[PDB]
Amino acid sequence: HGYHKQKAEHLKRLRRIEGQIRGLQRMVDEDVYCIDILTQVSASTKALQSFALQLLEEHLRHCVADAALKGGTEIDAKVEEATKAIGRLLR
Amino acid sequence: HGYHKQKAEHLKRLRRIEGQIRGLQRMVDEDVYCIDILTQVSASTKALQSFALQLLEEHLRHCVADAALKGGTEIDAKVEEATKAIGRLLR
Amino acid sequence: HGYHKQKAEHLKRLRRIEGQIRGLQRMVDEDVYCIDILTQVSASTKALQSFALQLLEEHLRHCVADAALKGGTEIDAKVEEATKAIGRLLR
Amino acid sequence: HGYHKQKAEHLKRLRRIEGQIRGLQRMVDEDVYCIDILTQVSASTKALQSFALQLLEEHLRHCVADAALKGGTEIDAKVEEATKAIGRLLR
Numbered sequence: 001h002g003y004h005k006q007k008a009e010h011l012k013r014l015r016r017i018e019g020q021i022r023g024l025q026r027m028v029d030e031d032v033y034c035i036d037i038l039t040q041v042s043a044s045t046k047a048l049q050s051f052a053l054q055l056l057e058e059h060l061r062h063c064v065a066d067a068a069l070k071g072g073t074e075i076d077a078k079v080e081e082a083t084k085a086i087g088r089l090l091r
Numbered sequence: 092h093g094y095h096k097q098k099a100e101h102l103k104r105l106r107r108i109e110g111q112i113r114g115l116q117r118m119v120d121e122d123v124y125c126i127d128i129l130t131q132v133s134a135s136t137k138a139l140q141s142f143a144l145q146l147l148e149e150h151l152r153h154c155v156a157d158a159a160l161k162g163g164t165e166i167d168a169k170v171e172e173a174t175k176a177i178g179r180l181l182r
Numbered sequence: 183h184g185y186h187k188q189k190a191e192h193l194k195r196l197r198r199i200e201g202q203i204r205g206l207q208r209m210v211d212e213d214v215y216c217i218d219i220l221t222q223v224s225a226s227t228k229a230l231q232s233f234a235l236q237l238l239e240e241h242l243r244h245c246v247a248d249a250a251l252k253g254g255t256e257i258d259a260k261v262e263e264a265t266k267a268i269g270r271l272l273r
Numbered sequence: 274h275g276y277h278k279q280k281a282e283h284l285k286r287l288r289r290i291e292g293q294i295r296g297l298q299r300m301v302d303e304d305v306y307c308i309d310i311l312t313q314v315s316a317s318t319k320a321l322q323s324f325a326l327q328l329l330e331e332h333l334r335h336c337v338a339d340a341a342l343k344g345g346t347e348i349d350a351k352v353e354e355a356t357k358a359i360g361r362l363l364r
Contacts, residue, residue: 010119011120025102028102034149035176038147042143042180042182044139045140045143045180049136052132056359057353059125059126060333060337061349064333064337065348065352068341068342075338079330079334082333085126085129086329087326088129089129090326090363144268144272147268151246152257156257157250174238174239177238189301193302196294197298200294200295206287207287207288210284216331216336217332217355219328220329221358223321224361227318227322227325231318234314238307264308267308267311267312271311271314273319
């Protein structure tokens with residue numbers, strides 16, 4: 001249940017993030033001080049970044065590694081794709 | 092309805108972000124290719140960043156400006172706080 | 183010497199960053215392990231971000247505050263500009 | 274000269290970044306408007322990020338791939354390291 005382990009934890013992290021977004025809506029609805037709203041926006045963006053890093057790690061480990069066993073063209077295509085994805089996350 | 096305008100649009104943006112997070116859960120549930128999941132994580136983090144910038148703009152315009160009219164100590168405290176908040180968003 | 187204090191420290195921070203970039207060139211010239219090069223790239227990007235936050239703080243405190251005393255149009259223009267600049271730093 | 278190609282371009286990019294940092298020092302020395310200084314800070318941080326992505330791509334392609342051919346423990350160690358490095362760049 002290695003897949004099943006990672007999946008259940010991904011879904012738990014995402015459920016937590018989804019509640020944070022509902023929290024933000026409540027904050028706006030109540031006119032909570034903007035700095036406090038920003039603090040929660042940052043906590044949410046950070047939880048998403050942390051989720052992205054776990055996905056990246058699993059991707060590199062399985063997908064990108066498996067391409068190395070197939071050949072050069074395959075690994076180049078996978079690394080090019082992962083690198084574009086990391087570039088998007090960087091912004 | 093200037094407050095009411097900004098509020099309604101903040102809530103619309105947040106409702107959109109909340110659906111994106113439910114989208115991510117569906118992607119994980121269906122084992123969508125990880126790069127595609129990352130693309131959506133990045134779109135969500137970016138929508139949150141864009142929301143944060145709008146809040147910051149409104150904060151600077153009203154709160155931080157109003158402190159300038161009160162005095163030096165007041166503006167220093169507000170600018171110190173906004174700058175810490177921006178530092179958190181930067182990460 | 184409040185201006186003179188901040189100026190001298192800005193220049194010291196920048197001189198330190200400039201040496202870090204020369205360090206990176208030496209690392210590449212010697213074929214240092216790429217992860218170690220990345221660690222130094224990150225330290226440099228972070229020192230630049232930290233410099234950017236100090237500038238932002240001083241800008242908000244003087245420029246953006248002084249605009250509040252002038253009027254609404256003036257503060258809106260200053261806040262719009264600062265917010266675009268922060269958006270650029272965010273990426 | 275594939276190594277030699279990448280090396281020469283890495284060094285050219287870094288020489289360009291080093292001049293940008295000297296540019297920043299001139300800006301501060303002349304008391305250039307802070308927003309303009311920020312614009313250059315952002316251009317420099319972005320050039321460094323772009324350099325980091327090229328290094329990452331080359332690292333993944335050679336180092337991380339070569340570890341896949343060695344075995345599981347080797348690839349896990351390499352992916353763990355690359356992922357920590359990407360986490361540092363993300364901030």
